[PDB]
Design an enzyme around this catalytic site. Structure first.
Site, PDB file in Angstrom:
ATOM      1  N   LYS A   1     -28.421  62.343  43.854  1.00 29.95           N
ATOM      2  CA  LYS A   1     -28.776  62.995  45.017  1.00 29.95           C
ATOM      3  C   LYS A   1     -30.608  61.657  44.645  1.00 29.95           C
ATOM      4  O   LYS A   1     -30.760  60.957  45.475  1.00 29.95           O
ATOM      5  CB  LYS A   1     -29.853  64.089  45.734  1.00 29.95           C
ATOM      6  CG  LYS A   1     -28.513  65.283  45.733  1.00 29.95           C
ATOM      7  CD  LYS A   1     -28.816  65.966  46.465  1.00 29.95           C
ATOM      8  CE  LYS A   1     -27.549  66.583  47.216  1.00 29.95           C
ATOM      9  NZ  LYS A   1     -27.497  67.984  47.677  1.00 29.95           N
ATOM     10  N   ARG A   2     -30.688  62.078  43.140  1.00 28.89           N
ATOM     11  CA  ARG A   2     -32.095  60.790  43.158  1.00 28.89           C
ATOM     12  C   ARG A   2     -31.280  59.353  43.230  1.00 28.89           C
ATOM     13  O   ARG A   2     -32.653  58.167  42.276  1.00 28.89           O
ATOM     14  CB  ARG A   2     -32.904  61.069  41.506  1.00 28.89           C
ATOM     15  CG  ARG A   2     -33.032  63.151  41.949  1.00 28.89           C
ATOM     16  CD  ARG A   2     -33.463  63.057  43.321  1.00 28.89           C
ATOM     17  NE  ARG A   2     -34.270  64.578  43.434  1.00 28.89           N
ATOM     18  CZ  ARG A   2     -35.049  64.470  44.379  1.00 28.89           C
ATOM     19  NH1 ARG A   2     -35.215  64.703  45.199  1.00 28.89           N
ATOM     20  NH2 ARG A   2     -35.219  66.009  44.226  1.00 28.89           N
ATOM     21  N   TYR A   3     -30.052  58.976  42.140  1.00 27.93           N
ATOM     22  CA  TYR A   3     -29.872  57.630  41.982  1.00 27.93           C
ATOM     23  C   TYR A   3     -28.494  57.360  42.971  1.00 27.93           C
ATOM     24  O   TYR A   3     -27.894  57.127  42.898  1.00 27.93           O
ATOM     25  CB  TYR A   3     -29.643  57.609  40.668  1.00 27.93           C
ATOM     26  CG  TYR A   3     -30.468  57.853  39.725  1.00 27.93           C
ATOM     27  CD1 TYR A   3     -31.665  56.761  39.466  1.00 27.93           C
ATOM     28  CD2 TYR A   3     -30.605  58.698  38.882  1.00 27.93           C
ATOM     29  CE1 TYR A   3     -32.661  56.864  38.703  1.00 27.93           C
ATOM     30  CE2 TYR A   3     -31.771  58.525  37.629  1.00 27.93           C
ATOM     31  CZ  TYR A   3     -32.450  57.885  38.018  1.00 27.93           C
ATOM     32  OH  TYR A   3     -33.885  57.954  37.383  1.00 27.93           O
ATOM     33  N   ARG A   4     -28.573  56.919  44.388  1.00 31.70           N
ATOM     34  CA  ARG A   4     -27.991  57.095  45.376  1.00 31.70           C
ATOM     35  C   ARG A   4     -27.497  55.355  45.237  1.00 31.70           C
ATOM     36  O   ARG A   4     -26.749  54.997  45.911  1.00 31.70           O
ATOM     37  CB  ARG A   4     -28.958  56.695  46.272  1.00 31.70           C
ATOM     38  CG  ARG A   4     -29.800  58.193  47.046  1.00 31.70           C
ATOM     39  CD  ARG A   4     -28.546  58.786  48.247  1.00 31.70           C
ATOM     40  NE  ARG A   4     -28.472  58.234  49.703  1.00 31.70           N
ATOM     41  CZ  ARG A   4     -28.232  58.755  50.705  1.00 31.70           C
ATOM     42  NH1 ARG A   4     -28.107  60.103  50.708  1.00 31.70           N
ATOM     43  NH2 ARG A   4     -29.035  57.548  52.058  1.00 31.70           N
TER      44      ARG A   4
ATOM     45  N   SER B   1     -33.751  54.384  23.765  1.00 29.05           N
ATOM     46  CA  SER B   1     -32.543  54.150  24.001  1.00 29.05           C
ATOM     47  C   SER B   1     -31.886  54.123  22.964  1.00 29.05           C
ATOM     48  O   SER B   1     -31.911  53.624  21.556  1.00 29.05           O
ATOM     49  CB  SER B   1     -31.702  52.850  24.849  1.00 29.05           C
ATOM     50  OG  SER B   1     -31.994  51.610  24.476  1.00 29.05           O
ATOM     51  N   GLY B   2     -30.162  55.133  22.945  1.00 26.41           N
ATOM     52  CA  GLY B   2     -29.449  55.010  20.983  1.00 26.41           C
ATOM     53  C   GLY B   2     -29.895  56.248  20.450  1.00 26.41           C
ATOM     54  O   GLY B   2     -28.910  56.866  19.792  1.00 26.41           O
TER      55      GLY B   2
ATOM     56  N   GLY C   1     -36.889  51.391  24.086  1.00 23.56           N
ATOM     57  CA  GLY C   1     -37.420  51.920  22.370  1.00 23.56           C
ATOM     58  C   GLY C   1     -36.096  52.775  22.038  1.00 23.56           C
ATOM     59  O   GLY C   1     -36.331  53.562  20.949  1.00 23.56           O
TER      60      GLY C   1
ATOM     61  N   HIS D   1     -25.667  49.572  24.901  1.00 27.64           N
ATOM     62  CA  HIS D   1     -26.466  48.751  25.415  1.00 27.64           C
ATOM     63  C   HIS D   1     -27.639  48.037  24.897  1.00 27.64           C
ATOM     64  O   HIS D   1     -27.778  46.562  24.132  1.00 27.64           O
ATOM     65  CB  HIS D   1     -27.585  49.379  26.174  1.00 27.64           C
ATOM     66  CG  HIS D   1     -28.420  48.256  27.226  1.00 27.64           C
ATOM     67  ND1 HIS D   1     -29.253  49.016  28.020  1.00 27.64           N
ATOM     68  CD2 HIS D   1     -28.634  47.089  26.950  1.00 27.64           C
ATOM     69  CE1 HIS D   1     -30.128  47.777  28.641  1.00 27.64           C
ATOM     70  NE2 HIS D   1     -29.335  46.856  28.234  1.00 27.64           N
TER      71      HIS D   1
ATOM     72  N   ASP E   1     -21.820  53.787  28.059  1.00 27.19           N
ATOM     73  CA  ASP E   1     -22.648  53.243  26.294  1.00 27.19           C
ATOM     74  C   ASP E   1     -22.857  54.020  25.631  1.00 27.19           C
ATOM     75  O   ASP E   1     -23.415  55.525  25.618  1.00 27.19           O
ATOM     76  CB  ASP E   1     -24.128  53.740  28.159  1.00 27.19           C
ATOM     77  CG  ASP E   1     -25.499  52.867  26.849  1.00 27.19           C
ATOM     78  OD1 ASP E   1     -25.427  52.245  26.040  1.00 27.19           O
ATOM     79  OD2 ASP E   1     -26.712  53.019  27.460  1.00 27.19           O
TER      80      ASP E   1
HETATM   81  C1  LIG Z   1     -41.194  46.163  17.984  1.00 30.17           C
HETATM   82  O1  LIG Z   1     -40.542  45.830  18.076  1.00 30.17           O
HETATM   83  C2  LIG Z   1     -39.548  46.138  18.844  1.00 30.17           C
HETATM   84  O2  LIG Z   1     -41.075  45.769  20.125  1.00 30.17           O
HETATM   85  N1  LIG Z   1     -38.798  47.292  19.335  1.00 30.17           N
HETATM   86  C3  LIG Z   1     -38.396  46.862  21.056  1.00 30.17           C
HETATM   87  C4  LIG Z   1     -39.134  46.986  22.108  1.00 30.17           C
HETATM   88  C5  LIG Z   1     -38.160  47.573  23.353  1.00 30.17           C
HETATM   89  C6  LIG Z   1     -37.217  48.108  23.379  1.00 30.17           C
HETATM   90  C7  LIG Z   1     -36.634  48.573  24.515  1.00 30.17           C
HETATM   91  C8  LIG Z   1     -36.233  47.418  25.831  1.00 30.17           C
HETATM   92  N2  LIG Z   1     -35.777  48.128  26.825  1.00 30.17           N
HETATM   93  N3  LIG Z   1     -34.992  49.147  26.009  1.00 30.17           N
HETATM   94  C9  LIG Z   1     -33.708  49.896  26.375  1.00 30.17           C
HETATM   95  C10 LIG Z   1     -32.347  49.077  26.415  1.00 30.17           C
HETATM   96  C11 LIG Z   1     -32.164  47.240  25.393  1.00 30.17           C
HETATM   97  C12 LIG Z   1     -31.009  47.645  24.764  1.00 30.17           C
HETATM   98  C13 LIG Z   1     -32.741  48.027  23.799  1.00 30.17           C
HETATM   99  C14 LIG Z   1     -33.915  51.137  27.301  1.00 30.17           C
HETATM  100  C15 LIG Z   1     -33.606  50.700  28.435  1.00 30.17           C
HETATM  101  C16 LIG Z   1     -33.509  51.841  29.285  1.00 30.17           C
HETATM  102  C17 LIG Z   1     -34.570  53.224  28.827  1.00 30.17           C
HETATM  103  C18 LIG Z   1     -34.541  54.308  29.543  1.00 30.17           C
HETATM  104  C19 LIG Z   1     -34.516  55.626  29.317  1.00 30.17           C
HETATM  105  C20 LIG Z   1     -33.531  56.215  29.626  1.00 30.17           C
HETATM  106 CL1  LIG Z   1     -32.972  58.194  29.167  1.00 30.17          CL
HETATM  107  C21 LIG Z   1     -35.067  56.527  30.547  1.00 30.17           C
HETATM  108  C22 LIG Z   1     -35.458  55.251  30.976  1.00 30.17           C
HETATM  109  C23 LIG Z   1     -35.398  54.447  30.633  1.00 30.17           C
HETATM  110  N4  LIG Z   1     -36.056  53.086  30.819  1.00 30.17           N
HETATM  111  C24 LIG Z   1     -36.436  52.893  31.979  1.00 30.17           C
HETATM  112  N5  LIG Z   1     -36.937  52.054  32.403  1.00 30.17           N
HETATM  113  N6  LIG Z   1     -37.555  51.614  30.963  1.00 30.17           N
HETATM  114  N7  LIG Z   1     -36.924  52.586  29.762  1.00 30.17           N
HETATM  115  C25 LIG Z   1     -35.054  53.200  27.390  1.00 30.17           C
HETATM  116  N8  LIG Z   1     -34.639  51.784  26.454  1.00 30.17           N
HETATM  117  O3  LIG Z   1     -34.572  52.080  25.408  1.00 30.17           O
HETATM  118  C26 LIG Z   1     -35.630  49.086  25.247  1.00 30.17           C
HETATM  119  C27 LIG Z   1     -36.562  48.495  21.806  1.00 30.17           C
HETATM  120  C28 LIG Z   1     -36.666  48.214  20.973  1.00 30.17           C
END
Ligand SMILES: COC(=O)Nc1ccc(-c2cnn([C@H](CC3CC3)c3ccc(-c4cc(Cl)ccc4-n4cnnn4)c[n+]3[O-])c2)cc1
Length: 237
Positions: free
Chosen positions: A160-163, A188-189, A186, A44, A93
């Site tokens: 069950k949490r992500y129907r 993720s990965g 931020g 992603h 992913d």
């Molecule tokens: C100074 O530079 C900056 O501002 N950098 C900067 C700012 C924001 C971003 C950012 C926003 N989205 N994402 C990602 C996916 C995008 C492809 C990167 C993302 C999505 C979901 C989750 C996540 C994971 C789990 Cl296990 C549980 C809940 C969640 N979440 C649900 N709702 N939110 N999180 C985490 N991530 O990371 C990263 C990246 C860099």
């Protein structure tokens, strides 16, 4: 990381920060060193990425503020995204970055082992999520790498949490019933790292979730053990 605490230097030496440089330089996501030329991260992350030319991999970083115009980084030679990836919530992913040169392993940059052959039925009870992401749903990238201990939950409970989603055996979920600790934007990965027999294993890749650290809404991670064959095929090709 929600509900986490600051890390110290050298505490998570497989953790990298992947930066994009377009239109300006900034942290894009986390990743994990798994080999001298190889970073494991989330597919992603590359949604907006025109090519590997704009990526920089920084290792041995505690504070984002350490990164200046003379800070050394690794160029990225190839981005390998799983060929079935469509979007994070539908699985696959996972992505490999092949670096332009080999990491020399040091106290501050070390590989993490993949889940070991024969360990398919291990119950991991010491799992940690790490990253520079938000501490709450509307926040900012953090300067200091954060950490949080998070318990794994069964795929049966997770479904069950992500129907509205298909939780498959290629996903693993982690979260407290009452919320409060989780990955967030931020992160993720980055790794879900679990210690077993005093050895750290890369059990998950931070992928997605409904909100951040909500009650009865665990984070969802790529289940790395289900991709070991894919990783080995790409890394010895
Ligand atoms: C100074 O530079 C900056 O501002 N950098 C900067 C700012 C924001 C971003 C950012 C926003 N989205 N994402 C990602 C996916 C995008 C492809 C990167 C993302 C999505 C979901 C989750 C996540 C994971 C789990 Cl296990 C549980 C809940 C969640 N979440 C649900 N709702 N939110 N999180 C985490 N991530 O990371 C990263 C990246 C860099």
């Amino acid at each position: 990381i929600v509900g986490g605490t600051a890390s110290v230097r050298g505490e998570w030496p497989w953790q990298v920060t992947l930066h994009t440089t377009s239109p300006t330089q900034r942290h894009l996501c986390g990743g994990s060193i798994i080999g001298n030329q190889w970073i494991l991260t989330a597919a992603h992350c590359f949604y907006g990425v025109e090519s590997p030319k704009i990526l920089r991999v920084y290792s041995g970083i505690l504070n984002q503020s350490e990164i200046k115009e003379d800070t050394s980084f690794f160029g990225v030679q190839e981005i390998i995204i799983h060929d079935q990836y469509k979007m994070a919530e539908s699985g696959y992913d996972i992505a490999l970055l092949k670096l332009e040169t080999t990491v020399n392993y040091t106290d501050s940059q070390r590989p993490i082992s993949l889940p070991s052959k024969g360990d398919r039925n291990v119950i991991y009870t010491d799992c940690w999520v790490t990253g520079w992401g938000y501490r709450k749903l509307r926040d900012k990238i953090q300067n200091t790498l954060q950490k949080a201990k998070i318990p794994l939950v069964t795929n049966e409970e997770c479904q069950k949490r992500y129907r509205g989603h298909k939780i498959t055996h290629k996903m693993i979920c982690a979260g407290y019933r009452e919320g409060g600790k989780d990955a967030c934007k931020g992160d993720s990965g980055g790794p879900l790292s679990c210690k077993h027999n005093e050895v750290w294993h890369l059990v998950g890749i931070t992928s997605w979730g409904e909100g951040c650290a909500q009650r009865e809404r665990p984070g969802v991670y790529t289940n790395v053990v289900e991709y070991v064959d894919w990783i080995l095929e790409k890394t010895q090709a």
